[PDB]
Amino acid sequence: TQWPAPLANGGKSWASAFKKAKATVTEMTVEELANITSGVIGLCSGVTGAVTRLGIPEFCLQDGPIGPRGVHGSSQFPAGLTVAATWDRTLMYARARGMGQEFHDQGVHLALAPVTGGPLGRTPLNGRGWEGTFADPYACGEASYLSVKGLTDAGVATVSKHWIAYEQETSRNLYIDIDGVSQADIQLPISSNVDDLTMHELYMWSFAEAVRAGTNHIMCSYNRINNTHSCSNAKGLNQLLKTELNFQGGVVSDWGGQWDSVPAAENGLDVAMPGKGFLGALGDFWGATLVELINNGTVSEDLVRDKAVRILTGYYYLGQDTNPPPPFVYNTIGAPTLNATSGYRNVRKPGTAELIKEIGSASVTLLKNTGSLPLKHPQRIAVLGNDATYNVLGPNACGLANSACDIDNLNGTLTTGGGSGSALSPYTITPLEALQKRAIEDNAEIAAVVANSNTTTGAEDAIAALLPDADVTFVFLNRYSEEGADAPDFSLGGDGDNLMDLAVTYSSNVVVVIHTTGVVDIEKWADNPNVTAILVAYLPGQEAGNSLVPVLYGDVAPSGKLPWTWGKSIDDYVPNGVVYTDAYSPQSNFTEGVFIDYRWFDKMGITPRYEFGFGLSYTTFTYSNLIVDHGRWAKDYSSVMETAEPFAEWDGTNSLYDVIFTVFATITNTGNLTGSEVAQLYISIPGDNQPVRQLRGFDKIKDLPVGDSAVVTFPIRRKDVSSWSVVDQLWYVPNGDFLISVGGSSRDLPLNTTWTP
Amino acid sequence: QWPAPLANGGKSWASAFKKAKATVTEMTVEELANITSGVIGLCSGVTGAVTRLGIPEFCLQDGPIGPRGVHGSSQFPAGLTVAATWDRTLMYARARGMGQEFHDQGVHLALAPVTGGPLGRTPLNGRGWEGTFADPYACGEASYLSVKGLTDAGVATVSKHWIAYEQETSRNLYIDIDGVSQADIQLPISSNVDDLTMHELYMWSFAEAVRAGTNHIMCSYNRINNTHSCSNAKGLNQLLKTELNFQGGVVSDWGGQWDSVPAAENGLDVAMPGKGFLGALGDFWGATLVELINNGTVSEDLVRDKAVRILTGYYYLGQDTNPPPPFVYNTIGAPTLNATSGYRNVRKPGTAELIKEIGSASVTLLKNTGSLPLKHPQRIAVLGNDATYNVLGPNACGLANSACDIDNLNGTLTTGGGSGSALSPYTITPLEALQKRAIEDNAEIAAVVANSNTTTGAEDAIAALLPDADVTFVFLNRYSEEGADAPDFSLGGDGDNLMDLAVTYSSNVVVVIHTTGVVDIEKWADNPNVTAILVAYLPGQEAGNSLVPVLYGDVAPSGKLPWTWGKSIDDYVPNGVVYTDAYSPQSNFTEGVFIDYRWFDKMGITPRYEFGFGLSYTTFTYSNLIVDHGRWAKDYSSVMETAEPFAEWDGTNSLYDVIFTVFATITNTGNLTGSEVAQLYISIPGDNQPVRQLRGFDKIKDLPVGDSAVVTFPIRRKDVSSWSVVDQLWYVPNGDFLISVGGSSRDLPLNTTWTP
Ligand SMILES: CC(=O)O[C@@]12CO[C@@H]1C[C@H](O)[C@@]1(C)C(=O)[C@H](O)C3=C(C)[C@@H](OC(=O)[C@H](O)[C@@H](NC(=O)c4ccccc4)c4ccccc4)C[C@@](O)([C@@H](OC(=O)c4ccccc4)[C@H]21)C3(C)C
Ligand SMILES: CC(=O)O[C@@]12CO[C@@H]1C[C@H](O)[C@@]1(C)C(=O)[C@H](O)C3=C(C)[C@@H](OC(=O)[C@H](O)[C@@H](NC(=O)c4ccccc4)c4ccccc4)C[C@@](O)([C@@H](OC(=O)c4ccccc4)[C@H]21)C3(C)C
Ligand SMILES: *[C@@H]1O[C@H](CO)[C@@H](O[C@@H]2O[C@H](CO)[C@@H](O)[C@H](O)[C@H]2NC(C)=O)[C@H](O)[C@H]1NC(C)=O
Ligand SMILES: *[C@@H]1O[C@H](CO)[C@@H](O[C@@H]2O[C@H](CO)[C@@H](O)[C@H](O)[C@H]2NC(C)=O)[C@H](O)[C@H]1NC(C)=O
Ligand SMILES: *[C@@H]1O[C@H](CO)[C@@H](O[C@@H]2O[C@H](CO)[C@@H](O)[C@H](O)[C@H]2NC(C)=O)[C@H](O)[C@H]1NC(C)=O
Ligand SMILES: *[C@@H]1O[C@H](CO)[C@@H](O[C@@H]2O[C@H](CO)[C@@H](O)[C@H](O)[C@H]2NC(C)=O)[C@H](O)[C@H]1NC(C)=O
């Protein structure tokens, strides 16, 4: 190609491990090479073939980004989306470390996690956006770094996903050939057509952080880029990833991401998954085929040895040889695809439940409050919505990927979304249970209508008879979405529209709580004065109720803020966010460039209902004394691995990630109660066609009492004030005035100053 | 798009600006239009008086070798000739001498020097000889010192010609005479120049002229991106008056103004020659400007700023407290001006000696197989009309040295043709000086100075004379002039046939060339009968006496070439001279910064003689290259400052600060004493950069055999900078800079690396 494959060298932290992988790979025969480099049958989502002669075992690759999927004896962690709404780096890390402990203890070698910027968030309808974090390169980047580090700090290799520009589910069109029908014969995958500036500034940003953390592996995506399959795109894999980001680890296909044998082998793919698993229905392009291609001379053997060095580097780095993971005991594929019995192991540790609850309490985001919260001691409480209670069939009734219950089933509290990113629950702590516990301590009465208000005989009349005398009425709403489809619009799931219409008819103190994978349409009720409060709780995992109720009653003040923009209409967002076509070669031209989510809204002067980084507290905060400390710089010492990203200011002993200055401000608690506050920093980088403002810092001040002040600090790296030059092929700091802005949301920025290089 | 910045006097003109501003505040509108446009008089241009306020007419006078068209002066060597000395002391002394003569003849404003237009995009440019080096850095230095020399005498300078004025062909000055108008035939050549080329190449020497304190700048005849230079708002209001912070006046060239209002809004200050020369060269201001101001289409405050700029120089040079004496010569000529001339002799003791010293220091030895220096030859032959006088007299060719007949034997080429020539009180011919020396040695000497192709018996004379000569000198010339480019490199007159004859009948031919530029000597340069070749450029009045001491070894040659001598015209920058009859003729400067040696170095072309080449009667060894990063210093001594933006500007900083110095050692490693010009080149890193760029020179005088001397090259911030088109400032790029020191642009035995 224009774009050859560089040999791994282990880079910074993996040098000893690389040396060991190389010795090992040097001893391997050609058939052994093809064994490790492709999937085999087993209990985990994927499993690499052993090298039995050299004592290298099968590796278990296991979903997913909330913790091991399809296993018992584990915990159901909150989604990436939930942890992002915390804006709390300490929780991002702790979440990942805790997940990591469960992956390791269940016997997993390679976790298929985290989601580090694919999907990032170009459409708010993406059915899997929830697995990610923030709709913003900088914040996604930070969360990715910590998610990768928490996982690797436990025993577990990571597979950061999905590289790259994987921004819609519709027409993702994975390769499958089952019962005589092949995707190849119907429609090729969505092609993301992305300019060079958009790729560096937007989509590669989080991956760069994931490498720096360093992820052991990267999963390539289902989409094509510029009409070439991501999994065999030489520019993407060989040049952008293995050269500019200097990635020393392995590229793993997504399951059905590999569409051909030879292009994938020359153009950057290291591991073909799932290979013989899943009946070979997702393609099985390597294995014996790859042996035959090497021996008949059409694929370089040395190219394939490199693939193996990259897979083994992880094994040796994480010490899986000298401290092997225990046996993986659960059948996670499911019968009749795999007929194999499951054992049982319990890996739930003390502390985990309390961590999941803490993330919940730290993320719930308060969007409207007219004075009804915090609750005092209300004596008569009504509760509406099947979201307040259990799945009528059991918390795990929807099966191994939380997606198999009937279209009209009452799924109960939405604690995670559908797909390969879900996990099972040992229990669900329901909002109704936790409210009732509180009602009981206050000698109060509480009643819930949890039926489908449209279809259950008597439900509407039960609601009308219950609500008028309630002191407060909680309505729980939800909006399930899942991998493999995008949401068609912002409509609430189930009967939620109906429930809202009945609620505001019969009560003047409606508190609304939404469990959701993404933005929903609340335009019909949001300005109704009967709705005194609105909170979004995202996807809380198993501790749904006990994390929400302390916030409602004021034991702690809400402190979560939105990790994406909540527009009034789907029409306000980036146009053509989801392309639907029956064309053989479907096309998505990313013509918006870097302008996604809030940058789109700010550029077009569109006012969202709730902006990026919005969230209320039970107190108020005053910002003061913006300082730009030009003397507070520091060499980037601490990364696990280094990129080779070029940049104008390079010399011998220099980095794109050096801190070039630090900025400070002060916040004062100006209300009547203690609260935490998420401070945000935005920079306006000069140049043509630049976003109005780009997030470049956040800092969460915890439990700031009434009248007290605290200083927030924002280290600014060289990259943070840089632009990608498409003409030179490098990062540079533009000349001009940069506006530095600090405050409580993307549109609530009382403090501003100018910085010039 | 580009508003006109008001003058403020800047650095050294503050007190003069204040006086200027005051006088102009009192002027009526008619007085404003009087001072800002040309009137009739004895000098090349004359501003109108403002007689109520006691401001006299100012005399603007040609040209860059001294006051043109006067008697009683000396003929100085041309720009080209002083450039070949590579000697800053002589660059300054020459200017200071010209200045003294300018002042003493009555000139307020000298139409001098030439400071980077023409710079040298074509080696055929008919007026390239008026300038100095085909190189921005060296032209820069020469420009600075020439301005300084002229201003230190009583004279205001008009540095010229701004800008990108790189061919005479289709220069197409404005003229309307006997009913035919240039405007109806052809617009001027349009120099289309990209932004980096303009900053890195063409503006360089003008920036130096600004810093030196030039009082004014003359806009050129060409257009730039299809807009006339004298009404180019990007050129005059932005590039010159903003980025270069120029506080003085912009004077039109004579016929350079094509309109009334665009010129007044876009940065012109002085319309010349106005009523002069029969108003034939347009007369767009004057009473027309008065009318434009009165009816409100031209702002009066705008015009007051023109007038301020003109008067600042008057007051700065103290021309009110010490006025020049009256100008007494008719330099325009009858019938255009019928006015009698008086007489003044301004030639001072020491000027003839200075003119001789520049010739001796500039003559450049290109080849020597062992015939030079002469010892005491007994039988000397001399060929060529270049060896003696113009058969009609040194000044027969008139006020611009350009009116003799195409076939006239003009004798020794001491200056070129045009507005930058000057009259001579005498010519010391090469033949007279050779004879004087022959007579000391008791020798015989005979000269064949007729036209060897056209005069009965010349060929047979040459054939009978040369076989018995111990040495044959052949004197060659190539005349060129303003208003035309040379069609090719061929020698003037009978020169080719002279050379064919000389090498047929003699095996010791020493060739001396007097020339405005590169010539074609391919047919003879490698003939072993030609034992030496020297180029003496345009030596002014002391042609013979400057040359003969060098030939006989009283002093070794020390001159080196100020431009590249390629083997063929095809080896230079393509499209150097565009020839078309198109109404809007175009010259696309696609070569960018790559002119003269930069072109040759980038295309892998070997010249016959490289830029900065010249032999000595001895040899030099270079050693011990030192880059002293500790030897830095603040820019303190400029007369005026620019406002050129640069990335490293803080409060109290300059683009002209010395950031480091380089040193090297030279050893005279031959058998005779000699002077050496050491040169420094720097390879600035980046995209499409020249291989090498001159960034210094230092001439060591008369180094004795076996002796060593240290050569010193201060390096300014601008000297290692690149212009960023994206950011619109100068920056020092990152990467490795190669620093090379040596005797020519292709003989660089020392090199080292500097990274910042
Ligand atoms: C297509 C697909 O994604 O399959 C995989 C198996 O590896 C893929 C990765 C994926 O993350 C995984 C494990 C999941 O976890 C998904 O959540 C997941 C899916 C999205 C789902 O896939 C779909 O709904 C497909 O659109 C659907 N596709 C089609 O029917 C189809 C067939 C031919 C041409 C074009 C399309 C399908 C349904 C059932 C079996 C295979 C394919 C299958 C699948 O059973 C799950 O699929 C299987 O368990 C399975 C696949 C093939 C053979 C036997 C079992 C699914 C679940 C768990 C429901
Ligand atoms: C055209 C031109 O450059 O004229 C000037 C006068 O100011 C100009 C500046 C220039 O430096 C100056 C003084 C010179 O010194 C030049 O060396 C110089 C010239 C270049 C020369 O001009 C030319 O040869 C022109 O190409 C020539 N041009 C044309 O004939 C012509 C006519 C109509 C349309 C287009 C072109 C010309 C000859 C004679 C008189 C006017 C113009 C005129 C001129 O006589 C000299 O011109 C005059 O003395 C003069 C001009 C106009 C009317 C009367 C006298 C010349 C000399 C001294 C010979
Ligand atoms: C290629 O991979 C397969 C599957 O991992 C290896 O076969 C397994 O070998 C292990 C020992 O490491 C046995 O306990 C399993 O029974 C085998 N599984 C099956 C399905 O046969 C196989 O040995 C590997 N081949 C090579 C050449 O190393
Ligand atoms: C309950 O969960 C089930 C899945 O476990 C949801 O049913 C899927 O809904 C999507 C819409 O997002 C459809 O595209 C699928 O066809 C449904 N799956 C099946 C197997 O039918 C269901 O919508 C959820 N219930 C509610 C009220 O939202
Ligand atoms: C405009 O300028 C002209 C020409 O310089 C001035 O006329 C001359 O005035 C001087 C004194 O400054 C006299 O000695 C000359 O006799 C005049 N010459 C001619 C040709 O008339 C004129 O005075 C100026 N106009 C103004 C308003 O100052
Ligand atoms: C002549 O035209 C060129 C070509 O447009 C001009 O160069 C541009 O200058 C501006 C600054 O004024 C830059 O932002 C552009 O990038 C330049 N383009 C190139 C290709 O160099 C130049 O300024 C014009 N010169 C004049 C005197 O008008």
Ligand SMILES: *[C@@H]1O[C@H](CO)[C@@H](O[C@@H]2O[C@H](CO)[C@@H](O)[C@H](O)[C@H]2NC(C)=O)[C@H](O)[C@H]1NC(C)=O
């Ligand atoms: C002697 O000088 C005269 C000028 O005074 C030269 O004649 C001019 O030559 C150019 C070509 O270089 C012609 O375009 C002009 O038309 C000529 N001028 C006149 C007035 O006829 C002449 O060429 C010189 N003699 C030699 C031998 O070079």
Ligand SMILES: CC(=O)N[C@H]1[C@H](O[C@@H]2[C@H](O)[C@@H](O)O[C@H](CO)[C@H]2O)O[C@H](CO)[C@@H](O)[C@@H]1O
């Ligand atoms: C620093 C430099 O040399 N830049 C280029 C310049 O072209 C400019 C520049 O890229 C920028 O401001 O955008 C304008 C408008 O598109 C563009 O013209 O000039 C030369 C042309 O001689 C480019 O090739 C340079 O690379």
Ligand SMILES: CC(=O)N[C@@H]1[C@@H](O)[C@H](O)[C@@H](CO)O[C@H]1O
């Ligand atoms: C200042 C100037 O002369 N010209 C432009 C200007 O439009 C732009 O704002 C600036 C950025 O600093 O750079 C140049 O591209």
Ligand SMILES: *[C@@H]1O[C@H](CO)[C@@H](O)[C@H](O)[C@H]1NC(C)=O
């Ligand atoms: C608010 O609720 C009351 C019943 O409590 C009802 O009478 C009224 O119509 C409701 N208002 C709106 C705007 O829905």
Ligand SMILES: *[C@@H]1O[C@H](CO)[C@@H](O)[C@H](O)[C@H]1NC(C)=O
């Ligand atoms: C100069 O005198 C001549 C007569 O020899 C005449 O033709 C011409 O017009 C006069 N010139 C001027 C400018 O008056």
Ligand SMILES: *[C@@H]1O[C@H](CO)[C@@H](O)[C@H](O)[C@H]1NC(C)=O
């Ligand atoms: C050199 O000169 C001699 C006369 O001395 C002549 O015979 C010979 O042909 C000439 N050689 C060349 C190469 O012109």
Ligand SMILES: O=C[C@H](O)[C@@H](O)[C@H](O)CO
């Ligand atoms: O894209 C889906 C998931 O991210 C991936 O982990 C595999 O498909 C295995 O289920």
Ligand SMILES: O=C[C@H](O)[C@@H](O)[C@H](O)CO
């Ligand atoms: O361009 C020619 C000369 O440089 C200039 O000084 C004037 O034209 C006056 O003769």
